[PDB]
Amino acid sequence: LPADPSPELKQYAHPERLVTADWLASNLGRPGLVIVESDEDVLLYDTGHIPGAVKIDWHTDLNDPAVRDYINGEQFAALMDRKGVTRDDTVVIYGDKSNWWAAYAMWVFHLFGHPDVRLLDGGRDLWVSTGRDTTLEVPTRQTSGYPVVERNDAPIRAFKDDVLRVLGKEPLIDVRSPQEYTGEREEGALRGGHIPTAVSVPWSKAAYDDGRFRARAELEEIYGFVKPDDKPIVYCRIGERSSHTWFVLTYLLGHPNVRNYDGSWTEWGNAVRVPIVVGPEPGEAP
Template identity: 60%
Template structure:
């Protein structure tokens, strides 16, 4: 039994170890995908055979603030040689922050054959595993996606308002400074800024990275995660939970933890997050 299987997760199969990845680099039916915050990392060296899916260029709509539509997702899959039966194995920098975001977008289109590499890029490089600058090319595929499902794991502003009024739990995964409103946005960074600081009323502050072990970026064991989300913050597995951050990427990580590792059935990611809420007229804010 692997270390991952011993950690008490609700769905341990959604994680693979770096060792597993090293042993499956050439396994048919698997596509390794790197998703990073830092655009320099993949070209500077990546897991052999991995393709890059970039959060700005590949996952977001080029014009509207939204994600790909069905046809665009199908094109992305075809370009990267991914079929409906391919198991997509995500990894990335920052404790898999952006890899979890890509994973979440894939779930909007129902691609459930998806896994995260525990520890991501950090653990892979710490173990001195091979990296290459060779960008692979795979034969284009035919991929048929479902229509994007925004109803199950994605939350919109008005739904969040209803959620707040019903006093249901929210998790604010930003830094404590952002939660208190001390840090609004950085100078010269208006595109991710907000006119008001603070947090959505009732939201509990659990910075996203608390779910990861800082030494190697792996996820904490289920008992440790429960101590944070349930012991400290009072969440319950049967709760309807909405997670948010600034633009919805860090909260994808927390969505992943609550949904797959702790087995919560009803967790949504509010990707409008603080850049929408903190700029919206008339919505309630707490400091």
């Protein structure tokens, strides 16, 4: 399955990681293609979805049931088999909330090295608002033999001690709302504020009101502070909005070495004796 050749995507650094709605409509039902809906709301898929699409739920399908961590390689293989995905298939992921959870699912697939994963520009919001076909029908396809791979965290994931070591030496980007960043505002925390030196670029700035990713030129200016030799870290409350910003910096802008700090404010704002800055200014390193 070749890349979507639509002219409007060529403006980006790695255009092959996106597909348009008209491309997807003409390719529905084709062999070697699997379509995946991934939403914040676990109930939404059952109200209607793109024909042939399967469902993945981030909470029940992608997390360990006991410790705060993702599933392992043996468990990822079993999930692919149950969903009818082979190692050789093109996977296209889409969902509600401007593709926040679709980007998170794509980030998790990258931990297991799935070769060809792409997002639908505009996601579920645009598909539905433009009046395109949906169905209640749930697919029955099942496959077997997805390979058992060792999970590879280092290239795309940062832990709490990785963050402490680079304070003052690399760009740290907080993607929450302005009121969260200053400390004015299940997911609560005992302290409010941001990590010392962090800069505020809310995930919003990268998307239009209809859910599509913004034009290259608009992106170049929001994120132009990031220099070519930089190794940036992104974060939020639990790591979904930071997933959206990871995709933007990596594939649309072509910046290598971006890591997602998944622990995020739920870890940091609850830990005893870690440094915190309150108010609208970034602050100094410790």
